[PDB]
Design a protein around this nucleic acid. Structure first.
Lengths: 96, 91, 79, 96, 77
DNA sequence: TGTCCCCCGCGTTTTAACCGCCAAGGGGATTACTCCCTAGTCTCCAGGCACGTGTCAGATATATACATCCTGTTCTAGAGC
DNA sequence: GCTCTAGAACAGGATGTATATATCTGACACGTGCCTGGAGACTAGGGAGTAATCCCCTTGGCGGTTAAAACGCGGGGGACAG
């Protein structure tokens, strides 16, 4: 049962997902979540495909940048595992 | 050239809200800067809204959307309520 | 349809963190990033629907979405 | 002689400098620093007193916010002291 | 020499206003450096604003516009 | 520093995403035409900007009262002979 | 059973922040002396509204197939501290 180390495949996935620009969240769940969020604002609202696409690109970019900031917070705290306190600190630093 | 100031306007607003509360000159300058900054932000948002759909005019709906975009939550809702009440009192 | 916050799956979050260079990903961060992704989405979506309602528009276009992103200082290129 | 524990004088200074809005940075060194910085861009450049005041207020508020973020990062790292790495992390998250 | 003109107790008071209990000894130079960078950016913007108006003195007004164009708007001026 | 809980890495299933084609009905775009509401100009008057000045809100300050820190001291519990 | 060391909690003294005037220069804001700027009212033609398709395109419906997510499982990693 050859098994790789818990942390080498992590770095390999980091390199793979940093080199590639393919999107990570599937389009259908993100579209459904966008419709769920928007149904509280406007009743019977339609989303064009390019609108959902752009929203997905922006959302993944924001999440990726926040993940780099939380990772930097983790290494700053002499740690490897990110925790929701890192996300809260990163949000509060930018005043979000 | 001469420079505009909102000393009397903020003064009468304060006396309408608190009739027995004064305000300093530095606080007057802070209020002036705040009102001018909000005016510039709302006017820029309304101009962007007009340019967005090839409209050469700014109406009450442009300022409404600008307020809803800038002001958050219940502050935005109360601003729309006050603006609507002002327009209905005008007409 | 409701309860769509679970659409952003845990492996999708893991992929997003790997793109961010995160080696070790806690099991408790997935709820938090779903919350922050939701909050960012409500902000951008409420700006987009105000843009849509301003222009007598009923379907949300890509243009308004990226204009909303730019007015929150997060301008998106390519649309 | 009377001795105070490490921290209560610090907390008292925090309180007394947070209730009042006095000018912490002295006028003359900040003015001299402003003139030194501006002399590399434009020679024989003057600064009115209210301009120096405004720049000093903006700088002091910015440095206070940066120190707040620095202390926030220090508490996130389970640390009481604030280190230059904390300032670097806060500026990197803030994109400065 | 005016970069060191600002004092260590001034930086301590600045951190006290920021709610910091204690300050490390090697962060004073880093705070001075980042303050120099911020002041350099703001002063460069104000210098460009002053030179655009054919003016040789940096007024307070274009300073607050220089700060506001950087997302750091100043009130009271 | 030891460790026991927490996260990662193949296995398996299943589970929904991506895809391929089409009805189809609500919605963005602009042409023919109209409208009421908006830029410009003539005159001016009541809202508005700048200087004078009384004084009361605020600023600086001494002295004195309530509140907390601390050192002194008295008492009681327990070890030793 | 008698002698004696040491821990423990108020007792008064020291010091700190704080209220109470005491007062004093200081600008807040009314009064006034003007004053410039839009209110009232034509002139009218340019942008917006209404429609009027129009299409178009995005939502939903037949699945097919399969990359991927959820299910625990196992041993290594390491996050939280004294």
């Amino acid at each position: 049962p050859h098994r790789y180390r818990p942390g080498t495949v992590a770095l390999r996935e980091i390199r793979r997902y940093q080199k590639s620009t393919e999107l990570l969240i599937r389009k259908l769940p993100f579209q459904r979540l966008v419709r769920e969020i928007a149904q509280d604002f406007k009743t019977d609202l339609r989303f064009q495909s390019s609108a959902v696409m752009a929203l997905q690109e922006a959302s993944e970019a924001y999440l990726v940048a926040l993940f780099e900031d939380t990772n930097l917070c983790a290494i700053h705290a002499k740690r490897v595992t990110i925790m929701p306190k890192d996300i809260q600190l990163a949000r509060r630093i930018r005043g979000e | 050239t001469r420079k505009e100031s909102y000393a009397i306007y903020v003064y009468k607003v304060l006396k309408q809200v608190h009739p027995d509360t004064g305000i300093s000159s530095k606080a007057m300058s802070i209020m002036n800067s705040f009102v001018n900054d909000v005016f510039e932000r709302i006017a820029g948002e309304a101009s962007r809204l007009a340019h967005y759909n090839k409209r050469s005019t700014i109406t009450s709906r442009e300022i409404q959307t600008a307020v809803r975009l800038l002001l958050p939550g219940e502050l935005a809702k109360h601003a729309v309520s006050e603006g609507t009440k002002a327009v209905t009192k005008y007409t | 349809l409701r309860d769509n916050i679970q659409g952003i799956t845990k492996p999708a979050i893991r992929r997003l963190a790997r793109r961010g260079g995160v080696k070790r990903i806690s099991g408790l961060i997935y709820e938090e990033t779903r919350g922050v992704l939701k909050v960012f989405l409500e902000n951008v979506i409420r700006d987009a629907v105000t843009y849509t309602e301003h222009a007598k528009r009923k379907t949300v276009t890509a243009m308004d979405v990226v204009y909303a992103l730019k007015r929150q200082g997060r301008t998106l290129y390519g649309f």
